[PDB]
UniProtKB/Swiss-Prot annotation:
The KIKL motif recognizes and binds the NET domain of BRD3. Disulfide bonds: none annotated. Signal peptide: none annotated. It comes from Homo sapiens. Histone methyltransferase. Preferentially dimethylates 'Lys-4' and 'Lys-27' of histone H3 forming H3K4me2 and H3K27me2. H3 'Lys-4' methylation represents a specific tag for epigenetic transcriptional activation, while 'Lys-27' is a mark for transcriptional repression. Belongs to the class V-like SAM-binding methyltransferase superfamily. Histone-lysine methyltransferase family. SET2 subfamily. This is Histone-lysine N-methyltransferase NSD3. Residues 5-68 form the PWWP domain. It comes from the Eukaryota.
């Protein structure tokens, strides 16, 4: 376990670009990390965005978030993929939240950003 609740990370999931996240406890499993069905470690993350979403992400697809300018370094891990405008606008919102979160303590971030989960009736 390298990440704890409230840690800021970048996550690379499916078709999406590296995305700013906050590690959090899964509302059902009450853990922020687990070993998956293939025996690999995963972390539970909240994606910063105007659209709250969460996911379990494989540890190899998670990186410590040091700042928005680290994005170029992640791509370096000349040819470049373009990015759709709608997705870029959502990513810019997520980054603005991540940058604000970076200036907070882990306790302040947990209070400010942890999602509220409502059971579907
Ligand atoms: C980056 C990203 C990766 C991902 O796998 N998902 C899924 C989460 C679960 N629901 C279906 C999308 N959403 C996002 C995302 C994108 C923009 N705003 C919020 C979240």
């Amino acid at each position: 376990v390298k990440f704890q609740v409230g840690d800021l990370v970048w996550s690379k999931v499916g078709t999406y670009p590296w995305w700013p996240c906050m590690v959090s406890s899964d509302p059902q499993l009450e853990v922020h990390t687990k070993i998956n069905t293939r025996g690999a470690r995963e972390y539970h993350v909240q994606f910063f965005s105007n659209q709250p979403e969460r996911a379990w992400v494989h540890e190899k697809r998670v990186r410590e978030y040091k700042g928005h300018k680290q994005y170029e370094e992640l791509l370096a891990e000349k040819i470049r993929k373009p990015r759709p405008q709608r997705e870029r606008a959502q990513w810019d919102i997520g980054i603005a939240h991540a940058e604000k979160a970076l200036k907070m303590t882990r306790e302040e971030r947990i209070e400010q950003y942890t999602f509220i989960y409502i059971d579907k009736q």
